Structures are given as C-alpha cells and as structure tokens.
C-alpha cells in the first residue's frame, strides 16, 4: 500500500514541476523491487533528466564564466566544483538504481534497451564534467552500455521504435561530442534517420509523437555536423 502512493505522488510532483520530489518518489517506487511499466519508466526518466538537466545547465553557466576569468577570484571555481559534485551524486544514484534493480529485473527488450540507454546517458553526463584517466574509464562505461542497448534494439525492435531511435540519437551525440568520433556519429545518425524515415510514413497509427521530435534532433545535428 505504498508503491501506488509513490507513483501517484510522482505524477503530482511532475504536474507541480517539483522534479527533486518526483525523483525521490520514483527512487522509492523502484526500491519496492517490482518492475516498472512503460508509463513508470518515463516518470523515472523525466524526474532525473530534469534534476540533472538543471545541474548540467548551471555547470555550463559557471564554466562559461571561468572562460572570462581575467577577461575572476577563486569563488567561481569553488562554486562550479560544488555544482559538479552534486551532479555527480545524482548520476551515481541513477546508475546505482539501474544496476541494483532495473537492468537485472527488466522483463522485455524495450525496457532493457530503455535502461541501458539511461546507463549510457548518465555515464555520458559524468563524462561531460570528468577529466583525465577517470574520464577515459567513464567514456568506456558509457560506450559499453550504449553498445549493449544497440545490439538488443537491432535484434528486438523495429527501426522506427521511438526508444531505439532515441538510443541511436544519443549514441551518435556520444560519438561526436564525447568520444571524438565525428565520422562514426554522422554515419550512425544518417543511417538512423534514413532507415526510420523510410518506414515512418509507411506505418499505421504507431508511436509518432515520440518519433517526430527525435527525428527533428537527428536532422538538426546532421545539419550542424555536415
């Protein structure tokens, strides 16, 4: 009699735009041990993507101010390091949930792909702020998770599946911005865009709200990269 309350309050927290609360309710719901529905997986992802998104945005602002420095003071670095540490803590919490519960207990391919894409994504967010030998380890972990998700999605889902599309979109962004593999990023995004495009307009009332927004992002990235 608590899991239903946690998911209902996570839905309320989203409506009230209280994403820290939403993330806490969804972490509690995951910790019940039961698998998440498609609706519940999105509440978990929406909650943490908004929490970490605000930290990523704040981090970019403070790092950009450091790119001014003497055209100042140690306070910008200190405060950026505080934001950086909090962001890392949230990513570690998400990755902990994925490994201690969700990836092991995922019952189907679409859910397994969803969580492995999340694992690649939160290691990628850690890579955005990481430096040195630690960054190399984090990049390897992100590529491993995305590659496993790619292998499963290719064998189990259609090329137009929104979750398969979003995975490929994010893995191409990982290649361009994180791994310094622009050629592989363009190859993947162009392959993704074309294979999905050829089938999108030939389907019958399938998931189009998901596909349309993702394929705009693929088209836009390809425009900037080529």
């Amino acid at each position: 009699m608590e899991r239903a309350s946690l998911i209902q309050k996570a839905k309320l927290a989203e409506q009230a735009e209280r994403y820290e609360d939403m993330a806490a309710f969804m972490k509690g719901a995951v910790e019940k041990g039961e698998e998440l529905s498609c609706e519940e997986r999105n509440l978990l992802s929406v909650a943490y993507k908004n929490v970490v998104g605000g930290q990523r945005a704040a981090w970019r602002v403070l790092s950009s101010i450091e790119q001014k420095s003497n055209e100042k003071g140690p306070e910008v670095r200190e405060y950026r390091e505080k934001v950086e540490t909090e962001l890392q803590g949230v990513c570690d919490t998400v990755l902990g949930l994925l490994d201690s519960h969700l990836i092991k207990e995922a019952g189907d391919a679409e859910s397994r792909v969803f969580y492995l894409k999340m694992k690649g994504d939160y290691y990628r967010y850690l890579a955005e702020v990481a430096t040195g030998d630690d960054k190399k380890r984090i990049i390897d972990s992100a590529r491993s998770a995305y590659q496993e998700a790619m292998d499963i999605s290719a064998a189990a889902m259609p090329p137009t599946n929104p979750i398969r599309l979003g995975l490929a979109l994010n893995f191409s962004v990982f290649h361009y911005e994180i791994a310094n593999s622009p050629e592989e990023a363009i190859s993947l995004a162009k392959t993704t865009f074309d294979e999905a495009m050829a089938d999108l307009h030939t389907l019958s009332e399938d998931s189009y709200k998901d596909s349309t927004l993702i394929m705009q992002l693929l088209r836009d990235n390809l425009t900037l990269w080529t």
């Binding site: 979109l169 993702i214 992002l217 990235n221």
Partner: peptide, 8 residues
Amino acid sequence: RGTSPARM
C-alpha cells in the same frame, strides 16, 4: 543539447 527527450 540535441539529445532525446526524457519521455519517449
């Protein structure tokens, strides 16, 4: 960024 929405 030009990465996927949280909900999909």
